[PDB]
Amino acid sequence: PIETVPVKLKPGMDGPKVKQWPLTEEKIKALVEICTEMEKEGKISKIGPENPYNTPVFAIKKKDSTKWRKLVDFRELNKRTQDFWEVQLGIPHPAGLKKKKSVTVLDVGDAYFSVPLDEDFRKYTAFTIPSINNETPGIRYQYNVLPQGWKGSPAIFQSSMTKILEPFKKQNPDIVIYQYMDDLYVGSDLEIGQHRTKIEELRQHLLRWGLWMGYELHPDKWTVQPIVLPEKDSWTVNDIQKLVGKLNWASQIYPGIKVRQLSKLLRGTKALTEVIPLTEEAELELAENREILKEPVHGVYYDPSKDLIAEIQKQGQGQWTYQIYQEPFKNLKTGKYARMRGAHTNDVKQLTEAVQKITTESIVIWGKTPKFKLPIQKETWETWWTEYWQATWIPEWEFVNTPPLVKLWYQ
Amino acid sequence: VPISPIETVPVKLKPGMDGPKVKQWPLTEEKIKALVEICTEMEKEGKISKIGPENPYNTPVFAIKKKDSTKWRKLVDFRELNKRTQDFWEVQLGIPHPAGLKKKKSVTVLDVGDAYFSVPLDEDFRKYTAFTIPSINNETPGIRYQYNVLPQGWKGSPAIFQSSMTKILEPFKKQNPDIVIYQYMDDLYVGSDLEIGQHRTKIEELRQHLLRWGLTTPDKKHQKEPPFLWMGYELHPDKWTVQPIVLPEKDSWTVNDICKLVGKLNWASQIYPGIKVRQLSKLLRGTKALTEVIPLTEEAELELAENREILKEPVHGVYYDPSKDLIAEIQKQGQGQWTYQIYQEPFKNLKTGKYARMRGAHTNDVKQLTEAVQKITTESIVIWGKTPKFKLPIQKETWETWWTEYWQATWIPEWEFVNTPPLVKLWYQLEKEPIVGAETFYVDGAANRETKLGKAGYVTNKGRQKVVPLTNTTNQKTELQAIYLALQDSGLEVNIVTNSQYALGIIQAQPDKSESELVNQIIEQLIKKEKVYLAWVPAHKGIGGNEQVDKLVSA
DNA sequence: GGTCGGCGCCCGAACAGGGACTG
DNA sequence: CAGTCCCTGTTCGGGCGCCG
């Protein structure tokens, strides 16, 4: 008996038409039980081939989670409804969420099933469940409530969400609450003990309205990865050549970098392994360049209208560096991740984990999901990435092949 | 017109479009008799109805022969209607392969006849399915009908039938969960582990459950005893094989003949291991005419004779056993070709296959092996829904050296090493540090965009030097040529310093094959070396001999 | 015959996007 | 400076096979 919020696509665009990719047996069995149960609860209903729209669907398990979770790749749909969740019902981003001692994520996706979806928009939420060896044709469904993973769902539920959070925000005014997709980010400066206690208070505060998760974060302990120069005592020709190329590449970010005196040491046609003593003018040029790399880049600031872009570099031995920017060489944040799951045995698992950790930090700091430039081939990525995904959202990505040149971000 | 028991599917036209209005083709008198004989029969059964001048739409119609039968099939040239009809989402996501079938006690195959003619069409949509049947006289106006059931030739007929058929089978599958029903268009593979007695009871239960909705299961197409003819295979209680494959024996081969031959070979490579189409597909490159005669090369005639000898022996696959693990083993067949077999017990192949794509201008065997594993993994999840264990002809240390040092993310699932030559290996290893006591080469190349002329050379620390004039070249080819010179005139251990990102980006990927002859010559020189260290310096910065050699090859 | 849909392959044409050089 | 040429990769379309 709830009124439906009318939703329309962006002008001059049709719904998503993305084919369903093959799914493993443990995933198809998980989707059949969930779709049958959701159909029994009236959340979804079967459709036919007269619906020309479709969206891929697969299942996941969150970190340390046994139950399967239905996930839809609404990325193509979210691109075609972008003016709705940014212009009309936009959610403000609290700048203090990243300054809290502890932030916890809660999967509130089960609450969207309480609000019905607009009748005219249900045509675009269509998806298909495949069968093993194509035993049967595609079993198709469509969403009758607010779908999990659609950017229009938290915008419609925002009015209902604020009224539920008002009794808790009044009792705890110093606690910051942000909502992005099917997740709820709660950050506070409380001690870790009473912090988790206030979480359980909100868990029961949400259970009495018709809604269980525990992932913790510590944004105050997030570090950046600056560009570092080696502290070598004996410099060879090859060492100075690599240093010049690295400093020359770093000059595109820090305009004050100079390599004039260091290039003067590479005047003769010397052997690479030959040791070269650093002149007095070169030792000062090396010390000044180290200090410039300590300085922050001039003129770098976040633009809310520009899209975020993240580049990842595999540096081997379980080391992965990343940079987030909107304009080239104007990087908003650099970093490095190490010893993640699958280190020294699986690159795809580490790359999948790295994309998740980067996207999580982007939601806390700016409230946006960046577009990734992944150092992997497409077919390699599109084959295994679903086997390691543990998040309810999915960022956009493209595939690059930039062979290394000099190692700018890792020593 | 009575109401069909099956629910109809609402179909619309694309907004801002009217129905088709196209003139009928001139038909042969033999096809006219077959059409009027069928049109009058389908009209009696309530499948097509007469229409008057109030229907301003029309579409062509013709008929082709049915395979191994005197009956004809009616088809409609709906090419103009399909353009203006709404888009449909096909529910046929793929193909049912016999390698995914599980061993069942009893098996029954049946095919319903004129199935498109047993499923109704949307009432508001029948007006656009108007067609004219020309009479034996060109002056006779002709009889105009409209379809009341799925027309053969319309782009929505298969998509509507496959979804309507699944809806009818859902109540039977819900009441009979342990019954496996492979549903592909108008063919039903019904198997069960029930006793042979209760099997035919459920078989007749389904033939009556399908009869309640207007679907007839004739006893002519009914199959109760093996071997079953299903999806172009021969299903036996323990093995399966494809129906007999016939290759053309043309004395004069056209492009069309080669295309048909390659297609049949691709179909055969599923169970017939060792099929190669490399040299036969090399006959289809750069050709323009489908009917152009092309002589067979010596490498193509040998490849055809080998494939003919493989098709002489009888091969057979087995069925999937979910209790034991899935195993896939790959062999390097030819330069750019790969073959694989998927099995659970030794020499009992579930199915075979091949992979041979050339991705990129420069690649190695490790890249191609990774591509094949991915092609097999996707194929396995389609059929069996799981990733098989791999037996790869690559050393555990060889792969460990590759993926750890490669800059891209690469990975292979759980696999073990099999010692079946030829073994995939890395042909040369670039050193990570400069080599002590090795001659250092500073190379560079340049060319002119207009003259297509340039130089390429090097300067060493021991005073060695060389510059070579080059004709009809580019800036990239010279910088590669400068490296090739440094590899020719150097000892077994050599340090090479370049400023070409393009040249360095190709060599560090450790390729063993390339479309460029200059790269293959560089690869050949790299294999002969013992220690090779590459390094990149920015050009035009006065670095070592890189500025000295940049000025020599300037023109 | 010159219908539709599904799936696979092999080829070329067309398109795309980055790197080094030039008015 | 923008505008190319060079190069390489992807996407798409058009053939053939197979099935219904």
Work out the angle between the directed axes of helices B396-405 and B365-383 (0-180°, nearest 10).
Answer: 100
Please state whether beta strands A215-217 and A183-188 pair in parallel, antiparallel, or not at all (unpaired): unpaired
d(CA A241, CA A6): 63
* Closest by Cα among B497, B494, B489 to B530: B494
Contact B128, B13 (CB under 8 A): yes
Return the residues preceding each gap in chain B, C–N over 2.5 A, or none.
none
Contact B115, B248 (CB under 8 A): no
Q: How far apart are the first and last CA of chain A?
A: 62
> In this structure, what are the phi and psi dihedrals at residue B78, rounded to the nearest 5 degrees?
-85, 30
Q: Does B258 contact strand C, using a CB cutoff of 7 Å?
A: no
> In this structure, what are the phi and psi dihedrals at residue A49, rounded to the nearest 5 degrees?
-80, -5
d(CA A38, CA A42): 6
- DSSP reduced 3-state for A272: coil
- DSSP reduced 3-state for B160: helix
Work out the angle between the directed axes of helices A158-171 and A192-207 (0-180°, nearest 10).
Answer: 130
Contact B386, A25 (CB under 8 A): yes
Q: Does B13 touch chain A (CB under 8 A)?
A: no
Q: Which helix (H) or strand (E) holds B190?
A: strand B187-192
Q: Does B172 touch chain A (CB under 8 A)?
A: no
* Closest by Cα among A305, A370, A303 to A335: A370
* C-alpha count within 13 angstroms, C-beta hemisphere, residue A410: 18
> Which A-chain residues 20-39 have CB contacts (< 8 A) with chain B?
20, 22-25, 28
Longest dimension (CA), chain B: 99
Q: Does B264 contact strand C, using a CB cutoff of 7 Å?
A: no
d(CA A247, CA A265): 15
Tell me how crowded residue A214 is: count the other CB atoms within 10 A of its CB: 16
d(CA A74, CA A151): 8
DSSP state letter for A363:
H
> In this structure, what are the phi and psi dihedrals at residue B402, rounded to the nearest 5 degrees?
-70, -60
What are A338's strand-pairing partners?
Answer: A319
Q: Which helix (H) or strand (E) holds A331?
A: strand A330-338
What are B182's strand-pairing partners?
Answer: B189
Burial of A61 (0-12, 13-18, 19+ CB in 10 A): middle
Contact B507, B532 (CB under 8 A): no
* Closest by Cα among B337, B410, B400, B404 to B367: B410
Retrieve residue B490's tokens: 């150097």
> In this structure, what are the phi and psi dihedrals at residue B373, rounded to the nearest 5 degrees?
-60, -40
Retrieve residue A32's tokens: 């059949």
Contacts of A320 (CB under 8 A, 6+ apart): A312, A313, A314, A336, A337, A338, A340, A350, A351, A354
Q: Do B381 and A22 touch (CB under 8 A)?
A: yes
CA angle A366, A369, A373 (to 5 degrees): 120
Q: Does A17 touch chain B (CB under 8 A)?
A: yes
Q: What is the dihedral of CA A376, A377, A379, A382, to 10 degrees?
A: 30
Q: Does B62 touch chain A (CB under 8 A)?
A: no
Q: Does B548 touch chain A (CB under 8 A)?
A: yes
* Closest by Cα among A61, A43, A55 to A392: A61
Residues 316-335 in B having a C-beta less than 7 A from any atom of strand C are none
Tell me how crowded residue A288 is: count the other CB atoms within 10 A of its CB: 12
* Closest by Cα among A72, A90, A66, A24 to A305: A90
DSSP secondary structure letters along A283-307? HHHHHHHHHHHHSPPTT----TTSP
If phi > 0 it is left, if psi is from -120 to 50 it is alpha, else beta; for residue B114 that is: left
What are B217's strand-pairing partners?
Answer: none
Burial of B197 (0-12, 13-18, 19+ CB in 10 A): exposed
What are B442's strand-pairing partners?
Answer: B459, B497
- DSSP reduced 3-state for B166: helix
d(CA B177, CA B136): 54
- DSSP reduced 3-state for B6: coil
For residue B356, the Cα-to-chain-centroid distance in whole angstroms is: 11
Closest to A403 (Cβ–Cβ): which among B92, B94, B407? Answer: B407
- DSSP reduced 3-state for B282: coil
Contacts of B373 (CB under 8 A, 6+ apart): B330, B390, B392, B412, B413, B415
- DSSP reduced 3-state for A57: strand
CA angle B448, B454, B460 (to 5 degrees): 130
d(CA B537, CA B546): 8
Retrieve residue A15's tokens: 């719904």
d(CA B223, CA B225): 6
Retrieve residue B499's tokens: 């400023």
DSSP state letter for B544:
T
Shortest Cα distance from B349 to chain A (angstroms)? 17
Contacts of B152 (CB under 8 A, 6+ apart): B73, B74, B75, B76, B116
Contact B131, B145 (CB under 8 A): yes
As a rounded value in angstroms, the CA-to-C1' distance for B287 and C13 is 13
Helices (H) and strands (E) in chain B, counts: 13, 23
- In the annotated binding site of A for Mg(2+), the residues are 107, 182-183
Residue reference for tokens 């290759």: B247
Contact B252, B291 (CB under 8 A): no
d(CA A260, CA B137): 95
- In the annotated binding site of A, the residues are 107, 182-183
Q: Which residue type is seen at B429?
A: Q
Please state whether beta strands A309-316 and A371-374 pair in parallel, antiparallel, or not at all (unpaired): parallel
For residue B366, the Cα-to-chain-centroid distance in whole angstroms is: 22
> Which A-chain residues 356-385 have CB contacts (< 8 A) with chain B?
374-377, 379-381, 383-384
Retrieve residue B317's tokens: 């696959």
3-state secondary structure B377-441: HHHHHHHCCCCCEEEECECHHHHHHHHHHCCCECCCCCEEECCCCCCECCCCCECCCCCCCCEEE
As a rounded value in angstroms, the CA-to-C1' distance for B318 and C8 is 21
Residues 163-192 in B having a C-beta less than 7 A from any atom of strand C are 185
Q: A252 to chain B: which residues are within 8 Å by CB?
A: none
Helices (H) and strands (E) in chain A, counts: 10, 14
Q: Which residue type is seen at A205?
A: H
If phi > 0 it is left, if psi is from -120 to 50 it is alpha, else beta; for residue A149 that is: left
> Which B-chain residues 259-278 have CB contacts (< 8 A) with chain A?
none
Longest dimension (CA), chain A: 84
d(CA B151, CA B62): 13
Q: Do A133 and B100 touch (CB under 8 A)?
A: yes
Contact B548, B442 (CB under 8 A): yes
Retrieve residue B366's tokens: 């490790």
Residue nearest to nucleotide D19 (CA to C1'): B231
What are B130's strand-pairing partners?
Answer: B146
Interface A-B, measured as beta-carbon pairs within 8 A, has a size of 208
d(CA A271, CA B441): 9
d(CA B549, CA B547): 5
Contact A386, A349 (CB under 8 A): no
Closest to B543 (Cβ–Cβ): which among A266, A347, A383? Answer: A266
DSSP state letter for B117:
G
> In this structure, what are the phi and psi dihedrals at residue B73, rounded to the nearest 5 degrees?
-120, 135
* Closest by Cα among B102, B104, B115, B92 to B187: B115
Please state whether beta strands A127-129 and A139-143 pair in parallel, antiparallel, or not at all (unpaired): antiparallel
Q: Which residue type is seen at A65?
A: S
d(CA B441, CA B463): 10
As a rounded value in angstroms, the CA-to-C1' distance for B553 and C20 is 16
Shortest Cα distance from A228 to chain B (angstroms)? 19
* Closest by Cα among B232, B240, B264, B192 to B350: B240
For residue B273, the Cα-to-chain-centroid distance in whole angstroms is: 17
Q: How far apart are the first and last CA of chain B?
A: 87
The answer to whether the peptide bond before residue B511 is cis (omega within 30 degrees of 0) is: no
* Closest by Cα among B256, B315, B244 to B288: B256
d(CA B307, CA B392): 24
DSSP secondary structure letters along B218-273? -TTT-B-SSSEEETTEEE-SS-EEEPPP-----SS-BHHHHHHHHHHHHHHTTTST
Q: Does B290 contact strand C, using a CB cutoff of 7 Å?
A: no
* Closest by Cα among B501, B447, B495, B494 to B474: B447
Retrieve residue A247's tokens: 């400093």
Burial of A394 (0-12, 13-18, 19+ CB in 10 A): buried
Tell me how crowded residue A56 is: count the other CB atoms within 10 A of its CB: 21
Q: Does B94 touch chain A (CB under 8 A)?
A: yes
Q: Which helix (H) or strand (E) holds B305?
A: helix B298-310
d(CA B285, CA B255): 10
* Closest by Cα among B448, B447, B438, B450 to B487: B438
As a rounded value in angstroms, the CA-to-C1' distance for A398 and C16 is 14
Give protein residues whose Cβ lies within 7 A of nucleic acid chain D: A 377-378, 399, 401; B 111, 158, 184-187, 229-232, 243, 245, 256, 259-260, 262-264, 266-267, 290, 359-362, 449, 474-477, 502, 506, 516
Burial of B411 (0-12, 13-18, 19+ CB in 10 A): buried
Residue reference for tokens 């194929």: B379
d(CA A342, CA A347): 7
Retrieve residue B450's tokens: 């207009």
As a rounded value in angstroms, the CA-to-C1' distance for A389 and C7 is 29
Residue reference for tokens 């709705």: A84
Contacts of B525 (CB under 8 A, 6+ apart): B484, B487, B488
Contacts of B85 (CB under 8 A, 6+ apart): B11, B13, B14, B154, B155, B156
Retrieve residue B307's tokens: 């494939």
Contact B501, B535 (CB under 8 A): no
d(CA B392, CA B419): 8
The answer to whether the peptide bond before residue A375 is cis (omega within 30 degrees of 0) is: no
Q: Do B434 and A272 touch (CB under 8 A)?
A: yes
Q: Which helix (H) or strand (E) holds A217?
A: strand A215-217
Please state whether beta strands B415-417 and B389-392 pair in parallel, antiparallel, or not at all (unpaired): parallel
d(CA A352, CA A342): 10
Q: Does B100 touch chain A (CB under 8 A)?
A: yes
Contacts of B269 (CB under 8 A, 6+ apart): B275, B277, B339, B352, B353, B354
Q: Do B374 and A271 touch (CB under 8 A)?
A: no
Residue reference for tokens 């043309």: B250
Contacts of B490 (CB under 8 A, 6+ apart): B439, B441, B496, B529
* Closest by Cα among A236, A251, A277, A245 to B541: A245
DSSP state letter for A44:
E
d(CA B166, CA B172): 10
Contact B529, B484 (CB under 8 A): no
> In this structure, what are the phi and psi dihedrals at residue B67, rounded to the nearest 5 degrees?
-75, 120
For residue B231, the Cα-to-chain-centroid distance in whole angstroms is: 18
* Closest by Cα among B179, B173, B177 to B191: B179
Q: Do A132 and B384 touch (CB under 8 A)?
A: yes
Q: Which residue type is seen at A365?
A: I
Sign of CA dihedral B217, B220, B223, B227: negative
d(CA B20, CA B408): 53
> In this structure, what are the phi and psi dihedrals at residue B450, rounded to the nearest 5 degrees?
-90, -55
For residue B325, the Cα-to-chain-centroid distance in whole angstroms is: 26
Tell me how crowded residue B493 is: count the other CB atoms within 10 A of its CB: 16
Residue reference for tokens 């890189």: B546
Contact B544, B551 (CB under 8 A): no
* Closest by Cα among B360, B366, B407, B413 to B388: B413
DSSP secondary structure letters along B323-339? TSPPEEEEEEEETTEEE
Contact A164, A106 (CB under 8 A): no
